[PDB]
Ligand code: HEM
């Protein structure tokens with residue numbers, strides 16, 4: 001009764017244009033079976049939202065990738081928060097919440113916004129730039145590693161390590177095999193910076209290590225919690241900011257509405273997160289036999305959630321293929337939903353807002369003037385190169 005589909009959502013053809021296949025996944029039924037990897041799939045908004053908010057049945061401690069930790073060894077020690085279930089997930093999550101707290105954003109917002117204005121001012125002096133390397137990558141690299149309290153040496157390992165982690169969530173294809181095949185130097189750097197003496201005072205890293213005496217985490221848990229921020233804190237904001245610029249480059253009408261009201265910068269970034277969904281997919285594992293969308297799913301089965309497809313489901317969104325900076329984006333699953341919803345979404349929204357704010361006040365037009373190249377990742381959707389000409393306001 002469950003439709004079987006041969007679509008490979010982790011193929012280069014799928015990444016190149018996933019929207020026709022995503023509607024096919026949605027319309028085939030509420031629950032599908034992907035014969036390519038022997039997993040269940042949910043593509044409509046309702047089932048994606050239901051699975052995310054049922055952590056007891058659709059657990060994360062057996063891996064949020066394709067690999068089942070009950071069957072295969074994890075390529076790295078499991079994350080204490082992303083790949084953990086309640087109650088073991090509760091207190092590590094609370095520490096990262098207080099480290100990336102609303103009170104923390106007040107201390108870094110001015111420096112984050114000043115670096116965004118300075119970056120746009122610098123890019124306008126060049127004219128024709130690469131919105132990926134010179135903006136989507138250059139800006140987060142100019143604020144986040146310093147906010148983490150990282151030293152200067154070795155920062156070129158951060159993005160390769162992140163692309164490795166998100167490629168590792170995928171199936172054992174060549175993208176995943178090649179990533180782990182080039183991995184030992186990157187984890188050696190990242191794991192070393194997770195140690196307390198290597199994190200500058202005042203940064204997120206030192207703040208995590210200071211939370212070890214409250215009884216919420218132990219000193220031996222702090223390095224892996226810092227590893228979470230070094231795994232997910234940079235590459236997500238790169239593809240999130242690269243998505244917003246790509247949207248404003250393809251939709252000049254929305255760029256003109258943003259210029260007229262720069263206070264829309266926060267929602268313009270949030271709508272970009274829904275439109276592109278830089279975090280495309282995540283898995284869950286059934287801890288029991290469960291009925292979902294008229295389909296019964298056995299225990300220990302992998303269920304693939306299409307977050308990007310749920311953000312474009314016409315059963316939930318009106319004109320889902322339209323970029324609307326004034327759309328009420330509340331409910332989108334670009335940051336997840338439930339107990340695992342993005343704990344660093346305040347940092348991500350701060351970086352996105354101040355960057356779109358700088359563009360809104362300083363840029364009059366963003367025109368693509370070069371060949372667009374896509375970056376292929378088993379989890380992340382984003383561009384490799386985006387040549388644009390920036391016209392000063
Ligand atoms: C555009 C930017 C971002 C997007 C689209 C995004 C997306 C997501 C999503 C979809 C989840 C849910 C994962 C799941 O339910 O299995 C998540 C969780 C998480 N994110 Fe973000 N994220 C972003 C930025 C960040 C930043 C800036 C940080 C840290 C500084 C971060 C750290 C984390 C962590 C640690 C988790 C695990 C939370 C948990 O398991 O309770 N992310 N993110």
Ligand SMILES: CCOc1cccc(C(=O)O)c1
Pocket residue numbers: 079080081082083165166227228229231232236279
């Ligand atoms: C989508 C953000 O979620 C992530 C991604 C990669 C690593 C981790 C972690 O907890 O180390 C979390």
Ligand SMILES: [Cl-]
Pocket residue numbers: 076187190191
């Ligand atoms: Cl590692």
